[PDB]
Each structure stands twice: as structure tokens, then as C-alpha cells.
């Protein structure tokens with residue numbers, strides 16, 4: 001079979017919040033017992049970097065090894081579209097495998113953020129749905145959360161971003177809670193994090 | 209050797225007796241040595257005699273693409289009959305078999321609401337009209353817009369999104385000229401789904 005390489009980006013929230021630590025993760029699977037050594041080289045815009053942290057290989061339940069290398073990235077490097085390449089060498093390969101990742105090309109556009117009460121018809125159910133519209137953003141990378149009185153909610157589903165005709169993206173998030181609370185008048189908050197926002201963050205609330 | 213992928217028919221094609229719903233068997237990476245590809249189709253075991261094979265197709269990456277298309281009875285697909293593509297090639301280790309069928313479970317009727325342009329867009333050249341469609345099952349659905357019978361096309365629709373009760377929702381966004389909205393033109397969001405009466409419903413709005 002021969003090894004395979006997957007290269008994963010940082011989470012958008014981690015590149016947008018200076019307090020978080022964004023990482024790019026290069027994962028090698030199907031490493032054989034006969035040729036277990038795996039070498040990583042990393043490059044940032046084709047210049048070799050030497051600060052990645054590579055973990056000991058780990059035997060999987062199918063008897064092949066998985067080996068992961070992690071490169072921490074500067075938030076502003078990632079946001080300035082630098083390109084991260086992982087090159088993986090292994091004696092079982094005819095040649096080194098390379099993977100490159102970077103954020104989405106294109107000019108950024110600031111999302112417009114709106115919230116919406118439950119469909120008035122829903123106003124007798126066990127539960128109600130709260131909506132958050134996010135539209136006109138570019139690039140597609142974004143995080144959307146819900147909180148109440150500074151507490152992370154979690155019963156929400158968010159559509160993927162949808163490419164709009166204008167080249168910008170939109171999506172909706174739908175938080176579902178107890179009928180009680182919305183009348184009770186608790187205040188719910190939709191949080192959006194995106195590179196084209198001021199402080200990369202904005203939040204819209206609503207209640208009864 | 210080559211890969212097999214087997215694709216369902218389109219939701220709309222199953223819901224309107226005037227349309228011709230098809231399952232579609234695609235083979236990639238067919239070389240020239242054994243360009244020889246055979247298909248057998250079966251519905252719920254019983255073999256049937258009507259699939260059609262396309263004129264085949266080359267990618268400049270050095271290989272072919274060979275498609276067999278079988279037309280289905282609408283009611284059969286909707287009742288969940290299984291559809292099997294059996295693919296034979298003098299270049300495969302063994303012949304490959306794929307089954308597909310409609311998502312299982314009790315159909316649930318969508319709820320459709322249209323919503324007017326936001327807030328601040330009225331200063332713009334253009335406005336967005338919205339259609340929310342929620343609570344449906346299975347996820348096979350078609351959503352379309354029109355104005356005075358005329359179909360629009362300047363609209364985009366999120367994919368179905370799985371909700372926590374195991375039903376689905378989506379939104380569709382139609383972009384129009386501020387001028388067309390303001391003259392009180394009527395816009396309609398149309399939804400086709402097996403759990404609706406006549407598989408069809410339409411919701412309207414205007415200034």
C-alpha cells in the first residue's frame with residue numbers, strides 16, 4: 001500500500017484569537033513495521049523551518065504506525081496567506097510525499113450579522129429555534145457560537161458557508177432551546193469570529 | 209484497476225411522474241488494455257432488462273470513464289427498493305457490486321416560510337428574499353423560485369442540514385432588484401418533497 005499523508009489546517013478560531021495557539025498538523029498513516037522511520041521537513045513559503053514538534057510513532061490496531069508532526073504558526077502569518085508544506089520521507093516510498101496548505105485566496109469581506117426570533121407558529125411547542133444569519137463574508141473560514149449570560153450554549157446547528165452569486169458567503173445558525181426561557185426572557189447571544197471583523201469578533205443578541 | 213461510484217436519481221425526478229428518474233454507475237481509471245466493461249442491474253434481487261451504456265469518455269490523465277444509466281419507476285424508488293450495479297472487467301481482481309436505495313424512515317413534511325429583505329438592504333440596488341424550509345425527512349428535496357410563473361435563477365440554497373430531532377432544514381436566498389420588489393411583484397418559493405401533498409407546495413411574498 002505505502003504510507004499516506006494528510007495535512008490539516010488550524011481551526012479558524014485559533015488563528016483569529018491571539019490568545020489561542022493555531023497549528024498545522026501533518027499526519028502520516030499506513031507506516032509499515034518493515035520501514036517505520038518517518039522524516040518530516042516543513043517549509044513556510046518554500047523556506048525550511050525547524051521548530052515543528054514531531055511525536056513518537058504510535059501503533060494502530062491494524063498494525064501500522066501513525067506518526068504526527070505539529071507546526072505552530074503565527075496568527076498573522078496564516079492570515080497573510082503564507083503556504084505551509086509538509087514533506088514526508090520514508091524508506092518504503094519511491095519519493096518523498098509533499099502536501100501544502102494555506103488559507104483561501106481572495107480579499108476579505110466583512111460579514112453582516114442578524115438574529116431572528118422563533119417562527120411565531122413554534123410558540124406553543126416544547127421548544128423553540130433561534131436563528132443567526134451571517135452574510136457577505138469572505139473568506140469562508142469562520143466560527144459561530146452561541147452563549148447566554150456568558151455561558152457557552154450548545155444545542156445549535158450551523159449550515160456550512162454557502163457561496164453566494166456575488167462571490168461572498170452566507171450561512172445560518174439555528175439554536176434550539178426550551179419554550180420556557182424565551183418567554184422567561186433570558187437573553188441569547190450569537191457570536192461570530194471572522195478575519196474581516198473588528199477585533200475579529202462581533203456578537204448579536206435577542207430575547208422575548 | 210478502476211474505481212466504481214453509483215449515484216441516485218435527482219429528488220425532483222422521483223416526485224413528478226412527467227420526469228424520468230435515473231441511477232447512474234460511473235467507472236473511473238479504465239485503461240486501454242481491457243477497455244472492456246460489462247454491467248448487470250438488479251432491483252431487490254430480481255434482474256431487470258433496461259440499463260443504457262453511454263458513449264465512453266477519456267481524461268488526459270491516461271484513462272477512460274464509462275457510464276451505465278438505468279431509469280426507475282417513481283413509486284419503487286420511493287418505496288425504498290434497492291438498486292444494484294454489478295461491474296465486470298478483465299482487469300479487476302473480482303467484479304465490483306454497489307447497492308443504493310432511498311434513505312429509510314417515516315417521511316416528515318416540510319414547513320415552509322418566506323421572509324422579507326433585511327433591515328438595511330433597502331438602501332441597496334438589490335434585496336434578498338428568504339425561504340426557510342424545515343422539519344423535513346428524508347433530506348431529498350428541491351427548492352425553486354418564481355415570479356409571475358417565470359422561474360428565477362438568481363438564488364442559492366444551503367444544503368439540507370441535519371437537525372437534532374433527526375429532520376432537516378435549509379434556507380434559500382433569492383436576490384432581486386430593489387425596483388422589482390418595490391413595484392409589489394409577487395415572489396414564490398416552491399418546494400418539492402415526498403411528504404407534501406402532490407409532492408409540492410409554494411409560498412408567496414410581495415412588498
Ligand SMILES: *[C@@H]1O[C@H](CO[C@@H]2O[C@@H](C)[C@@H](O)[C@@H](O)[C@@H]2O)[C@@H](O[C@@H]2O[C@H](CO)[C@@H](O[C@@H]3O[C@H](CO[C@@H]4O[C@H](CO)[C@@H](O)[C@H](O)[C@@H]4O[C@@H]4O[C@H](CO)[C@@H](O[C@@H]5O[C@H](CO)[C@H](O)[C@H](O)[C@H]5O)[C@H](O)[C@H]4NC(C)=O)[C@@H](O)[C@H](O[C@@H]4O[C@H](CO)[C@@H](O)[C@H](O)[C@@H]4O[C@@H]4O[C@H](CO)[C@@H](O)[C@H](O)[C@H]4NC(C)=O)[C@@H]3O)[C@H](O)[C@H]2NC(C)=O)[C@H](O)[C@H]1NC(C)=O
Pocket residue numbers: 211213215216217218229230231232234236237267269271273
Ligand atoms: C484522472 O482524472 C479523473 C477525472 O478527474 C476529473 O475529470 C475532468 C472533469 C477533468 O477536468 C479533471 O480536472 C477532473 O479532476 C479522476 O476521476 C475522479 O475520481 C475520483 C475518485 O478517485 C472521484 O471522486 C468521487 O466523487 C464522489 C462524488 O461524485 C462526484 O462529485 C464530484 C465532485 O462534484 C464530481 O467530480 C463527479 O462528477 C461526481 O459528480 C456526480 O456525478 C453524478 C453521476 O451521474 C451526477 O448525477 C447524475 O446526474 C444526472 C444529471 O446530472 C442525472 O440526474 C442522474 O440521475 C444522476 O445520477 C451528479 O450530477 C454529480 N454530482 C456533483 C455534486 O457534481 C465521491 O462521493 C466519491 O466517494 C468518496 O470516496 C472516497 C474514498 O474513495 C471518500 O474519501 C469520500 O468521502 C467519498 O465518499 C465516501 O466513500 C465511501 C466509498 O466511496 C462511501 O461509501 C461513503 O459514502 C463515504 N465515506 C464515509 C465515511 O461516509 C469519490 O470521492 C471523482 O469525482 C472523479 N472525477 C470525475 C470527474 O469523474 C481519476 O481519479 C484520475 N485518475 C488517475 C489515475 O490519476
Ligand SMILES: *[C@@H]1O[C@H](CO[C@@H]2O[C@@H](C)[C@@H](O)[C@@H](O)[C@@H]2O)[C@@H](O[C@@H]2O[C@H](CO)[C@@H](O[C@@H]3O[C@H](CO[C@H]4O[C@H](CO)[C@@H](O)[C@H](O)[C@@H]4O[C@@H]4O[C@H](CO)[C@@H](O[C@@H]5O[C@H](CO)[C@H](O)[C@H](O)[C@H]5O)[C@H](O)[C@H]4NC(C)=O)[C@@H](O)[C@H](O[C@@H]4O[C@H](CO)[C@@H](O)[C@H](O)[C@@H]4O[C@@H]4O[C@H](CO)[C@@H](O)[C@H](O)[C@H]4NC(C)=O)[C@@H]3O)[C@H](O)[C@H]2NC(C)=O)[C@H](O)[C@H]1NC(C)=O
Pocket residue numbers: 004006008009010011022023024025027029030060061062064066
Ligand atoms: C489503520 O488505522 C489508521 C488509523 O485509524 C485508527 O485505527 C484504526 C485501526 C481504526 O480503529 C480507525 O477507526 C482509527 O481511526 C487508519 O488511518 C486513517 O487513514 C485514512 C485514509 O485511509 C484517513 O482518512 C482521511 O481522513 C481525513 C479526515 O481527517 C480527520 O477526520 C477523522 C474523523 O473523520 C479523524 O479520524 C482523523 O483523525 C482526522 O481528524 C482530524 O485530525 C486533525 C489532525 O490532528 C485535527 O486537526 C487538528 O486539531 C487540533 C485539535 O485537536 C488543532 O485544532 C489543530 O490545529 C488541527 O490541525 C482535526 O481536528 C481532526 N478532525 C476531526 C473531525 O476529528 C479526510 O480528510 C481524508 O479525506 C479524503 O482524502 C481522501 C484520500 O484518501 C479523498 O478520497 C477524499 O476526497 C477526502 O478529501 C479529499 O482528499 C484530497 C487528497 O486526497 C484532498 O486534497 C482534498 O482536499 C479532499 N477533497 C475535497 C473535495 O475536499 C481521508 O478520509 C484517516 O484520517 C486516518 N485516521 C487517523 C486516525 O489518522 C488507516 O487507514 C488504517 N490502515 C489500513 C490499511 O486499514
